[PDB]
Design a protein around this ligand. Sequence first.
Ligand SMILES: CC[C@H](O)[C@@H](C)[C@H]1O[C@@H]1C[C@@](C)(O)/C=C/C=C(\C)[C@H]1OC(=O)C[C@H](O)CC[C@@](C)(O)[C@@H](OC(=O)N2CCN(C3CCCCCC3)CC2)/C=C/[C@@H]1C
Ligand SMILES: [Zn+2]
Ligand SMILES: [Zn+2]
Ligand SMILES: [Zn+2]
Lengths: 68, 76, 85, 1180
Amino acid sequence: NFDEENAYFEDEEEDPLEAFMAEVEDQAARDMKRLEEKDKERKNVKGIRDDIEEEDDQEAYFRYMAEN
Amino acid sequence: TIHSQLEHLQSKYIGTGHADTTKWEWLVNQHRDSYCSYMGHFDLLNYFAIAENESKARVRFNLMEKMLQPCGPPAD
Amino acid sequence: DLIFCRKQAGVAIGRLCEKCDGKCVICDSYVRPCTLVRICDECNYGSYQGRCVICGGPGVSDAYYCKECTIQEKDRDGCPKIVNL
Amino acid sequence: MFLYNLTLQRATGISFAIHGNFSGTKQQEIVVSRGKILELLRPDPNTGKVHTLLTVEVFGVIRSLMAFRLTGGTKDYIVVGSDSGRIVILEYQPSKNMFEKIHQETFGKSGCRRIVPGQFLAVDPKGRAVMISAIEKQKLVYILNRDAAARLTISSPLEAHKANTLVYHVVGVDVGFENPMFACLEMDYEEADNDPTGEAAANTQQTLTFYELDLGLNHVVRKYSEPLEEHGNFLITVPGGSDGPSGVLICSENYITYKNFGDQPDIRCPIPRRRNDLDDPERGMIFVCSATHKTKSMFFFLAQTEQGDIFKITLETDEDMVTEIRLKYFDTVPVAAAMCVLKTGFLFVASEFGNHYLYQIAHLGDDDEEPEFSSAMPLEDTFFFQPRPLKNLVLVDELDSLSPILFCQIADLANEDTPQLYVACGRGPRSSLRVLRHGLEVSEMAVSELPGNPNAVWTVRRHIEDEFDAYIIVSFVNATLVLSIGETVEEVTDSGFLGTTPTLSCSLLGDDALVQVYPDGIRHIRADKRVNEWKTPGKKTIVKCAVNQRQVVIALTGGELVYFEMDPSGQLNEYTERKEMSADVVCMSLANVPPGEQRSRFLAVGLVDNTVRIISLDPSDCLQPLSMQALPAQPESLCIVEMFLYLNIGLQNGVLLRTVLDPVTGDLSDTRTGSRPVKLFRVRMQGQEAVLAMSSRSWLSYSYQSRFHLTPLSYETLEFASGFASEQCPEGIVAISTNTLRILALEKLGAVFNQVAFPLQYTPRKFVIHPESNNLIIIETDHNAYTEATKAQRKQQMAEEMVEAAGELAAEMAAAFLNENLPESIFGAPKAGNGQWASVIRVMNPIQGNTLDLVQLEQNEAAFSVAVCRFSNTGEDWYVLVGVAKDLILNPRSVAGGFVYTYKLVNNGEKLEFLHKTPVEEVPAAIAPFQGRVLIGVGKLLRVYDLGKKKLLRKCENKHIANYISGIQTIGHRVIVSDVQESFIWVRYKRNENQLIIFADDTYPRWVTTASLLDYDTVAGADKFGNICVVRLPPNTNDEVDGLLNGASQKAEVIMNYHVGETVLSLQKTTLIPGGSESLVYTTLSGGIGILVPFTSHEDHDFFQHVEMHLRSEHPPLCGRDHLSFRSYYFPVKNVIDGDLCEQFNSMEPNKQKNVSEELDRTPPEVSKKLEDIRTRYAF
Ligand SMILES: CC[C@H](O)[C@@H](C)[C@H]1O[C@@H]1C[C@@](C)(O)/C=C/C=C(\C)[C@H]1OC(=O)C[C@H](O)CC[C@@](C)(O)[C@@H](OC(=O)N2CCN(C3CCCCCC3)CC2)/C=C/[C@@H]1C
Ligand SMILES: [Zn+2]
Ligand SMILES: [Zn+2]
Ligand SMILES: [Zn+2]
């Protein structure tokens, strides 16, 4: 956020959008209600992160040392 | 512990052995990397495709299909 | 607990300090430096940005593999940073 | 023993091919991969010729090749994955004509490995990510970006590893500037290694896995994975975004499937079959390659089957969903390894073996009556189509390719003095026997022999902007005759020369002013009919002149140097000074004055003095001596030429000199290439300057972007020639012979060897040469093949069965199915059966191509060895022995037996007549004449055989050879045996005891492909894995024998080891050039030819060793390989210098050439001359 130009500029100080916001609010409220209800969720796994779900080489080495 | 890490990294590499390795594991390892070496080297595949009178794509697909269970299923 | 990192190496260059400047990271030789050392991204981050790969002091120059280690392709393993546990 | 390796003819087999805008302009180029060579080609859209622009040796194994372009750029990059542990990105530089390495990223150890990436390479269609993959668990992804200077940046790799997984193919998926996606065909083998019943091996399916790279979060995730119906080969990227849906095409066995993630169902289409197919009904059908053509209006695909049938695939789509796949038969071409569809409507076909093709796509769209198959069509049962000759394509160009070379013999079977190379190459019905000759092939332009004494002929046009010449003037001893080209060339009157006495100079002086010089003077002739004449004072008579369209120098008796000039007025003005010297001139030459300057300064003067003198002729210091240099002998003519300035010195012998144009000589090169005077004449090759040297044989001297070539031609002696131009052919030569007036042409773009081809039937295995008639006895053999009789009876069977199909029996397709056989060289041979063979014996004349005799063998007999010999118990009769296998299976190996045929080879070596047929219990793989009898390797057994009246009589036998005899060679006393897996066994035959005893063997396992005896103790061998070795017996070796390593008691030493990179199948010691030295010539399966030559002194060896050492460091291989490690692939190098690395010195930049040369205590020209000397000593 630093620039001698940014400081210079930031120093001199003294209907359709509403419709879009209303539609977004209705959609967001419906999604929030569905998540709170947790009544109809099949938990469809989107994308599996292999690194997050699989032990690293260093972790495997630590496990081996602990075992023997 | 550097030697122990080397002993864990050598085990990690696929194709390495140890004092309990059997004949079957050794032989399937060398068959599998033989098939990969055939897929890699351009003039070995040429030799095989001329020998058995097939297209090179067919020989490649046959080798990939043989990759799954070379030397038959294991013991007991 | 002198163990190499051995993670996938990235675009970051390894650094050496004033005490380790001429040394090879793997065999500790001083003759014929040949290949520039690369380190992984977790070894090059934040406070770890510039640090000796052998000891961990402030880096001053590039780390190199020796010709002997380059001939045996010992520059082809992972990150050679010495990490202690 | 120290050897130097040289390549004479590079490989011509293609492995991969990509196309794109690699030079940054709008024209398209193709980058093809040989095994270890990278090459850029550019097809001409005006003539359809394919020209080679650049070819580089990479000293590695190229395994994957892709092209990609960043958004907003106009230039394509090249991504290479090789057998090193590096990914490389290259850029073509058109102004430097070289490949510039942009990026190098190291990720693993070198070699073709299971789990180190480099086999598979995919790229994002928008160019923001690239994936490199191995056949096993490891996969890496690099992000590609760009800085503000528009240079390419690469990131650190992201890992996507997955244990116990095999990969069949990876492609990038086309999304609409969404997160990059990659698709993979994967297989998990973990369950199959734990089930001893063998049921987890079956019941195991391929999956189609999708990998998504999240550039916002910087990681790769597995999103989708679905099991497939059956196992499929390669994938095809469907164009997505705003032009097309975004899925994949899976090519499989008998099917092609479309697939996409989301709500899209799967769409399957079966592959159509040929109606009345003759191939084994158990065999399936797969696609072998594909080609996409995207247009701003539509797209389609081109896929080819194993039979060589190209189908056109289109996709019937909705707003987002795909509904049908439609297939339509397009054409039949040879089976290709890659196909490239080029804008401007060209299809490039790179075949797996043999010549490559470029086709013009003549018919766009499809307005035709032939049926179009669809996935919506119901079928219980498969589609059928009829193959026909080419309809959519036209053949425009054909590139020669010697791959695969299977057998070679270097021999003088014609009665020239230079030997020719007889090469059995090719596979299937496209095999052939090719004769290779070193030189250029003279194309016939015109012939009309006229009686008289022809001496010289020029080709001078009337205007300077004229592309049509004016006249050609052949001077007799008594007169001359000057003609013009009215397309019916005969006598001409309105020329203006009309010389009663001969014409020794005819030049275009002005725009349309002509200089006619003759023994009695010079008559300058205008455009209009006007002549200004200067004739001789008294009895001085000119013989030699030196013309140029701005100045004309002459030579009278006594070296009186007289110079003229024609200034912008356009007429004569002679200089004031006439410098005379001791003798009369014999040679001079005036360089073609360039349009940049006003006149020419240098004039080399060769006299009876035997000295070249260099003289100036500009008005400042005109005609005063500058530098003189004596000659070795009598000169005839010299000429200042380019392609930078040189001159050439022709002696009165068949030997030549060269000196670069400068006030002092700077370069020197002499070639012993005659006993007859050299005549130097002006010509134009490649549209630029060249000199046509003439001796008993006529040679063409031309550098080529620093590629000096002194190449002979395929015709005998001439006496005068010059360039030619006409409506008939605007670029040629007008050459004169004894009692002859010829016009000739040379149209081969820089080729070391000219070849003629003769077609064969099956894959040739081996041929021998009859010593008396010089005829060739060839054996051809193929697997999965029918004999002629079996084909005929199978077709008759299919006809009689289709006529009784139980249906009105009223319309007969069977009589039309039996009439015309589609040619197998175009549509392929019917590959039917697994243990089915087909073999043939052929007698062929090598001068012509005619087949003298042909013996066909039974169905499942396979010939593997052939020999021609004489037996001592018989007279001087010749015999042919053919070894044949009976019911051979290859995998698992099984054979029913073998036979040896015997023929009598009568009628002056033109006819074979059957004598008898001897059974053996194994495949006879090697037959060799030996001391009036024959040695035969019957599997593991080595036997001696004498000729009998009803069969061959076994005489001796050894039973201790290890595995399988693949070759036998004999020098007078000893026998050398090649084992399939062991290297070499030495045997002695005891003549009086009748014993074969093993007395020596080797200490290495070698998969020997061929062997060559170098002397009484040494053997040169080759290998399946691409290595050459030399093995020698120690001097201690005792021959008179009656194990220490479970082998023989005495061992042999290995004195040479070299990795070539390609599989050698022929080795032969021979002398290639007349009056040269003996070399070891080898031949490769990719179509390459090379030599290994010995060093004779320690100084040359040391110099070349230092050159190699310094070039290994300062000019490293292009794809990231270590040169010393590549030549040590299976064994460490021993006593070989790589001369293909050493000759890359001539293609470096001058700064690095100086840095290299100043360490050897030498200049770059001296190093270049030393490199050329050893090559011209042995090869061309
Ligand atoms: C077994 C010996 C010990 O390990 C010992 C070296 C070491 O344990 C001590 C501790 C310590 C810090 O005092 C070591 C001293 C270091 C040295 C004597 C080395 O010198 C240097 O580091 C100087 C500097 O780093 C680079 C100089 C350089 C390039 O000559 C380096 O040696 C080389 O690379 N060579 C060896 C190869 N040699 C040939 C000569 C032809 C062309 C150059 C390359 C090939 C050139 C010089 C240093 C040598 C000393 C061993
Ligand atoms: Zn080291
Ligand atoms: Zn340090
Ligand atoms: Zn690290």
